[PDB]
Amino acid sequence: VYKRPVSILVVIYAQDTKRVLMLQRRDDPDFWQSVTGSVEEGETAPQAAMREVKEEVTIDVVAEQLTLIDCQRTVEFEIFSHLRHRYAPGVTRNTESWFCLALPHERQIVFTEHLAYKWLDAPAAAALTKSWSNRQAIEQFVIN
């Protein structure tokens, strides 16, 4: 089923250490990222953010009474050529809404759709990802 060109980004980090959680994608093993996912029909960006966090990293924000911060930032970028196949014919642009999720500490992550995870300092995490929007969110909402 086609991914939708409306997505969310959840930058997860540790409040105490400020390290950022980076996940290794299965479709592009050189692509490390925060939590990302499409916004489904009839679902809001915050709803999709909490769903992806629960589906990808097994973190129930409602159960743990965590706070998903709406960054009130939306960006549009070109879908990577080698990844555009998952989108409807003709779709090349993707709009991404940013969210932040500050965990009290670093923790073991049980991922489902990624190959591995790694806690890195904000500058390192930003320099590691291939997504410029993911870099910008870490810099603007974790480093500063």
Author numbering: 5 to 148
Authors' text:
DHNTPase catalyzes the hydrolysis of 7,8-dihydroneopterin triphosphate, the product of GTP cyclohydrolase, to 7,8-dihydroneopterin monophosphate and pyrophosphate. DHNTPase belongs to the Nudix hydrolase superfamily (InterPro IPR000086; Pfam PF00293), which catalyze the hydrolysis of a variety of phosphorylated nucleotide molecules and their derivatives, as well as some non-nucleotide substrates like DHNTP. The motif RExxEE binds a required metal ion cofactor, presumed physiologically to be Mg2+. To better understand how DHNTPase catalyzes its reaction and drive drug discovery efforts, we solved crystal structures of apo, Co2+-, and Ni2+- bound DHNTPase in a new crystal form.
